[PDB]
Amino acid sequence: IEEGKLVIWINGDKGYNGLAEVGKKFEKDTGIKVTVEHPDKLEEKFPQVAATGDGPDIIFWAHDRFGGYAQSGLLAEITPDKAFQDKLYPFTWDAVRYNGKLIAYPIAVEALSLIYNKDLLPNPPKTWEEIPALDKELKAKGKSALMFNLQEPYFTWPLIAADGGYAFKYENHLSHNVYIMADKQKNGIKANFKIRHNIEDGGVQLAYHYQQNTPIGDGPVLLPDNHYLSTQSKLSKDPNEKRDHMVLLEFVTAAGITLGMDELYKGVSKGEELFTGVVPILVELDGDVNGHKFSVSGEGEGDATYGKLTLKFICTTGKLPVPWPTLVTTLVQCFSRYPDHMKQHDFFKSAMPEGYIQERTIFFKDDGNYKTRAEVKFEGDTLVNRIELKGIDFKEDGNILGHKLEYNFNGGKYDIKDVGVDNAGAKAGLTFLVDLIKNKHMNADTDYSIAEAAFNKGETAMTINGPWAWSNIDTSKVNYGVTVLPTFKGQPSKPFVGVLSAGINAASPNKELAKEFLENYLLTDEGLEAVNKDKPLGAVALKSYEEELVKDPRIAATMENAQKGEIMPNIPQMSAFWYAVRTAVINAASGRQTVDEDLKDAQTRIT
Ligand SMILES: OC[C@H]1O[C@H](O[C@H]2[C@H](O)[C@@H](O)[C@@H](O)O[C@@H]2CO)[C@H](O)[C@@H](O)[C@@H]1O
């Protein structure tokens, strides 16, 4: 990659001539040349060429591809300052966050709308179900009802998702519950639970945990009734830290015993006093996994009144030989928030200051096991967790010693084993589409060019497209409207919402130049206007400019369809999702197999 200039890749359906104008302004101010290209298949080309250390400085695509690029080490982390972050909408920054890092600049929000010819169809349809009849009426007059790209599953997905189709199931319960039981003959507690570790490229690695805790001291402890600890964890990194490390934020609350009405009728351990405020924490772990010896040190603080832990861990021996997420559980349940009515069940604090021994065995399914023994106690003002870990029977090339686990915890934000492409709602929607074809209301071979030319020539009354398409319709002089997509079985069509984003190649020697361009030239009112005037971007990420665009009814329609849809995940598994659904739609549409069979195939490919 040549130093001292910028090469930018953007898709050929976007305003690349307008983006080139912004490049020319950058060159007028700086002397630096900005070359804008639109290669074919750039979303497949980029990971190929970047993996060898080549390609553009800056890559534009919808946000859904960027997680995969990021997981493959192809994107530089961006760290705009807070003054710049405040210029863009938070919804858009969320779309470019990946396992704790911002991995691109967001540009604009894209959602499909129904685009209609007001001369042919002054009142467009509310439902998919009425389209066959409208088509029959229009065909009698030499026109058709609807043409849109049937080759890319982006454009059929709104109908597939309408009555219940989905890619990956969003985890609505992000806390993980660990059930605590009294262990009377150890005068302590025990627990067993499992952790899910997403594997890169798909699949889940299970870690079955078995735990026993015993007081160090001879003083009385609290032995609890059955209950649980509900834990949420967030793993991140410190941009200024050069060693191998993990930043961890956790929140933990006890639950599972409801107060009875008898307790209202006519209606704390000494160790608990040590946890009324912020307590410093130190963690030290000496480990040996298949003979690979390592040490970890951690420091931070706990606040049991919130159930909150904030810690940074460092591998003090160089590269950690196992993945960080596999050590989270091993690396202080005394910081749990127990509700007042449950505090007689808090073994962990009752054992302080002398502390407890915490022992586990952790079995990684179809791989090795960890055995851990820890002393958790106060040393002065500080709560210290000192751990010995021994790992055996691991595969040197397996998910743990081969570092094949995603950097997230307990499955992350989507259940990548729960795919919705072959459920009743997906089948109903694709069956409707295939029926449209069977009944000669659409043609299986229609693609983007064919549909755009028919709509822009006034041959078809409707199309389905994004904001980028509007300028060619303008040139055509068709009198058009942009509106809400039709309903299916009374439910909104649910387009997958994209955020056009600009990522920086990890191998670029022009990372600062790229940030200067993106922050001070593109992501300005004048920069966005220049692209927008070429091909409309949609609902832009820059607040100041979006305030001008919201008076356009086409933007209002875009937003209404975005609201009814769902933001695309940016998880690495999205690439497999889209490949599978593409094949399923093309095959079902051309009659190659039935709808049921094709969606079942898709589902098997993805999982
Ligand atoms: O069809 C699968 C395809 O859908 C999306 O791509 C969109 C893109 O977001 C729009 O900006 C535009 O160019 O149309 C594309 C459909 O042809 C996903 O972003 C993409 O990853 C996916 O492969």
Numbering used by the authors: 2 to 268, 275 to 338, 342 to 617
Q: How did the manuscript describe this experimental structure?
A:
Periplasmic binding proteins (PBPs) from bacteria undergo dramatic conformational changes upon ligand binding. We inserted cpGFP into the canonical family member, E. coli maltose-binding protein (MBP), at four different locations and performed high-throughput screens to improve the linkers and other sensor elements, resulting in relatively bright sensors with ΔF/F > 6. Finally, we report the crystal structures of two of the sensors in the maltose-bound state.
